[PDB]
Structure formats: C-alpha cells, structure tokens
Design an enzyme around this catalytic site. Sequence first.
Site, mmCIF file in Angstrom:
data_model
loop_
_atom_site.group_PDB
_atom_site.id
_atom_site.type_symbol
_atom_site.label_atom_id
_atom_site.label_comp_id
_atom_site.label_asym_id
_atom_site.label_seq_id
_atom_site.Cartn_x
_atom_site.Cartn_y
_atom_site.Cartn_z
ATOM 1 N N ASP A 87 55.530 21.946 58.134
ATOM 2 C CA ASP A 87 56.603 20.985 57.914
ATOM 3 C C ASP A 87 56.435 19.799 58.850
ATOM 4 O O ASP A 87 56.541 19.950 60.070
ATOM 5 C CB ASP A 87 58.000 21.617 58.084
ATOM 6 N N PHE A 96 61.358 9.021 64.553
ATOM 7 C CA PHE A 96 61.545 9.630 65.874
ATOM 8 C C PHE A 96 60.432 10.591 66.299
ATOM 9 O O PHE A 96 60.386 11.014 67.462
ATOM 10 C CB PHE A 96 62.872 10.394 65.922
ATOM 11 N N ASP A 145 62.126 22.819 52.964
ATOM 12 C CA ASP A 145 61.451 21.605 52.468
ATOM 13 C C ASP A 145 60.078 21.897 51.856
ATOM 14 O O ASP A 145 59.091 21.193 52.137
ATOM 15 C CB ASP A 145 61.355 20.528 53.571
ATOM 16 N N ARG A 158 53.688 9.659 60.904
ATOM 17 C CA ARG A 158 54.711 9.068 61.766
ATOM 18 C C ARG A 158 56.021 8.948 61.015
ATOM 19 O O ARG A 158 56.050 8.508 59.853
ATOM 20 C CB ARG A 158 54.280 7.687 62.291
ATOM 21 N N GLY A 159 57.097 9.373 61.674
ATOM 22 C CA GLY A 159 58.440 9.141 61.189
ATOM 23 C C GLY A 159 59.120 8.136 62.094
ATOM 24 O O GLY A 159 58.449 7.408 62.832
ATOM 25 N N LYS A 195 52.585 17.700 67.508
ATOM 26 C CA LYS A 195 53.841 17.046 67.198
ATOM 27 C C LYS A 195 54.555 16.727 68.498
ATOM 28 O O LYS A 195 54.660 17.563 69.390
ATOM 29 C CB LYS A 195 54.738 17.907 66.312
ATOM 30 N N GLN A 224 56.111 12.187 65.492
ATOM 31 C CA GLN A 224 54.763 11.914 65.018
ATOM 32 C C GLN A 224 53.886 13.141 65.164
ATOM 33 O O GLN A 224 54.108 13.981 66.042
ATOM 34 C CB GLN A 224 54.146 10.741 65.796
ATOM 35 N N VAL A 225 52.887 13.242 64.297
ATOM 36 C CA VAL A 225 51.843 14.241 64.463
ATOM 37 C C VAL A 225 50.570 13.461 64.739
ATOM 38 O O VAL A 225 50.227 12.527 64.006
ATOM 39 C CB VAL A 225 51.688 15.159 63.228
#
Length: 296
Positions: free
Chosen positions: A174, A30, A156, A27-28, A53, A32-33
């Site tokens: 990613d 904004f 990244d 989770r970020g 995602k 999520q996976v």
Amino acid sequence: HCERLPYDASKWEFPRDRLKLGKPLGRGAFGQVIEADAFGIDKTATCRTVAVKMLKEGATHSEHRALMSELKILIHIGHHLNVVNLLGACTKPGGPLMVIVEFCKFGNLSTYLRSKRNEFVPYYKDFLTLEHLICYSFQVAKGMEFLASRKCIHRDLAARNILLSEKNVVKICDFGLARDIYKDPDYVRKGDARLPLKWMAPETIFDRVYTIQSDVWSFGVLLWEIFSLGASPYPGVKIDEEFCRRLKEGTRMRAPDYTTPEMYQTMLDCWHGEPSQRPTFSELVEHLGNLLQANA
Ligand SMILES: CNC(=O)c1ccccc1Sc1ccc2c(/C=C/c3ccccn3)n[nH]c2c1
C-alpha cells in the site's frame, strides 16, 4: 488499535548511515517511497536495493503516528511471498521515521500490464500470456488469504497497490501517504475524504463498513484490471450518485478483453451484493489454483 502493538528495535532497527537514498518511486502530499541501497539489511555485508517510506515537507506529527502504526502492523502481519516484506526501520530520534521493505523491480501492476498490450498472447519471449495473468491473480489471492489469516484487511486493494518483482512474483503493498490521492483520478471526493470508489463494495460506499469480504469485492475489481491488461474500471461511466445507486441495484462491469469465461464468473462472484455470499480468499485460492492447472 495498532498503537498498542510492539516495536522490537533489537530485531528491526537499521542504521540510517547504512542506507543510501536515491530516486523517488512514489510521492504524495505528505509521504514518499524512495529507492535506496542498504548495506547488510538482510544478508551479512551485502548491498541490497530496497524501498523506503518516509514523510515529506508538509507532513505533521499525525502522519508520523500513522507511519509508525503502519510499521507495527507490518511487523504483526509478518512474511509471505505475496506481500511486500518488511526488512527494517529507522526510528531513532534526530532523524525521520523510515519504513524499509523489499524492492520490486517492475513497479505497480496497473502501469506494467498497460505497457504490455502489444506484448501479450493468450497462449514471444518476455510476452505476457493468459497463464501469467491467472498466475498473478492466484498469487494476490494467496497474499490476501495470508493477510486475512493475520486478522488484517487491506481497504485499498487495486492493481496500483500490487507490485511485480523478479520471476513473475507479485506482492501486495500500500503506497498510502506516498500516493497523491488529491491528483490521482482513482480517488474521488466523498465528504471530507478522497476514496477509491470504483474499487469499493456497496456496503463500504453506503455504510462505511470495511471487512475482508469488502476486500473480496476489490479483488474482483483487481481481476478485471488484470484481465483488461491494466484498463481503468467502469469505462465511460461518471463516478457519481447515479453510479453508486446502480451498483446497489446490481449493475456490474462487462467482461474485459482478455478474460476467460470462468475468470469473468469469478469477478461476478466477488461482486455479490451480499458480503457473506462472496467467496472467501481461501475459496478463491482453491478456485484459482484449479483454473491455473486447467490452463496448464
Ligand atoms: C504497507 N506499506 C507498504 O506497502 C510500503 C512500506 C514501506 C515502503 C514502501 C511501501 S509500498 C511500495 C511502493 C513501491 C515499491 C517498489 C518499487 C517501485 C517501482 C519500481 C520500478 C519502477 C517504478 N516503481 N518496491 N517496493 C515498493 C513498495
């Protein structure tokens, strides 16, 4: 310029009601996976665990656009063993955009290797070995050579963006928006951005230039992560203006605890000050292939 890319709904679209959403995998702020069970997504009438995602409360339409462009680039990239492969998407109005890729049982490589320090021997079932480490390295080089063949760059590349699946298969991914880059120490404030500075080439830090050859620099850092068994790069170094300056000067990390001599030289090669002087991923594939055979 991903906005111009095609989305073929007849090929990729998957009914939201055939997806059973489960526990979060990342989770970020904004995005999520989430782990999900998908009915018949890749094999007629068979249930398959997948990773999806999608956005989170807090996201805006601009994150939606970015997720749509991620979907289009994944279609453009296409399939390879060593990239997380697209299985489908939910794009129909009335529900959230969802991008569905294969599930990788063991999760990210940084966390995984860090868990195996007491279960590693250089040369015991389910113990990691030097062969495993060289094998993962070779696979990520194959996946990156493939990405380069598609005229794409990662931007990244790091062990946190490598996943371990069954039968020692690793896949480049990613997490993107599904990583909390504001809380993650791997990302450092630089202007209006939070950037993976420890993985970035000098030309990226100083000139904001991203190329496949800057990905190669990151691959060298990835190698260090693998052969340190998931340690954090630049141990005991503050990531500031002094760090960046010394990097341009030619300061490099020391050999990690589990490296071979030739793996360390490969890291140093990937860290050439001159982008054009670093090996390409094709060269890395050939070299790592030879190193793997030498180990066997
Ligand atoms: C470029 N976009 C992507 O890579 C992507 C697209 C759609 C959905 C997800 C991702 S990234 C990702 C992150 C984690 C995963 C996993 C598994 C994670 C896991 C497994 C076990 C324990 C903890 N975490 N499988 N597949 C994944 C894909």
